[PDB]
Amino acid sequence: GLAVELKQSTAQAHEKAEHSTFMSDLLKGRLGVAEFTRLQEQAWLFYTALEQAVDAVRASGFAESLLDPALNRAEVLARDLDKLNGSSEWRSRITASPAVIDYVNRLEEIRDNVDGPALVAHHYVRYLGDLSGGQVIARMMQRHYGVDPEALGFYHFEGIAKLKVYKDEYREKLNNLELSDEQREHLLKEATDAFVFNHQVFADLGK
Ligand SMILES: OC[C@H]1O[C@@](CO)(O[C@H]2O[C@H](CO)[C@@H](O)[C@H](O)[C@H]2O)[C@@H](O)[C@@H]1O
């Protein structure tokens, strides 16, 4: 099944992502609200691009049931940033890091080429992450740094009642997605690329 193969093919990349110095220090309480805010600013950039690609692919008629609009984060994230930054000034202030430029470039290639299988790979890596370790991240931003949960809306999925149930549903959708042999190979390859982009985002954030 695709869901298992995806999890296995990306296991090494997941571990490397999880143990990046920036993410490691952030989660262990060794940084601060400021760094979490820098992370969320960069995320707003790549989620904006991700969700444009999602919009394109869904509109094209591919992976429709997987591409649940309830997952959209860009507007929720903008409200978090308004809270974290104390105004909407950040919008005209933020600059993409070199890793984010590469990530956004890939996502815009996917969008404009309407590369459905690639988009699914990117969707899995980000959204299943948010529904998973993202829950731990939100808890630890509050506990380590006193971030108000009003500024952690990113990690809350309105009108998803049960996260584990949702993820099992998601994995079943992956398993039933019709793919040619090369589309499947491409999806798997792109999933590891997606993890590597995130690794590079964290590396730039650590400096
Ligand atoms: O579980 C998430 C993800 O982590 C991986 C590799 O990083 O597995 C590691 O962590 C698991 C628990 O979270 C352990 O059971 C496993 O032994 C360890 O390698 C991936 O396999 C997994 O999808």
79 close to ligand 1 (CB < 6 Angstrom): no
**Do 191 and 9 contact (CB within 8 A), yes or no?**
yes
Q: Write out the H or E segment, with its range, that includes residue 168.
A: helix 163-176
Rounded to the nearest 10 degrees, what angle do helices 2-9 and 163-176 cross at? 110
Q: Residue 157 in contact with residue 87, Cβ under 8 Å?
A: no
Residue 136 exposed, middle or buried by CB count within 10 Å (0-12, 13-18, 19+): exposed
Which one of 1.20.120.450, 1.20.910.10, 3.90.1300.10, 3.30.9.10 gives the CATH number of domain 1-207? Answer: 1.20.910.10
Sequence-distant (6+) residues with CB within 8 A of 146 are 33
Q: Is the CB of 16 under 6 A from ligand 1?
A: no
In the chain, where the domains are located: 1-207
Distance CA 113, CA 110 (A): 5
Q: Is residue 202 within 8 Å of 23, Cβ to Cβ?
A: yes
Active site residues: 19, 47, 125-126, 129-130, 134
Q: Would you call 149 helix, strand, or coil by DSSP?
A: helix
158 is in an annotated binding site: no
CA distance 12 to 195: 10
Nearest-10 crossing angle of helices 2-9, 11-18: 50
Question: Resolution in angstroms for this experimental structure?
Answer: 1.7
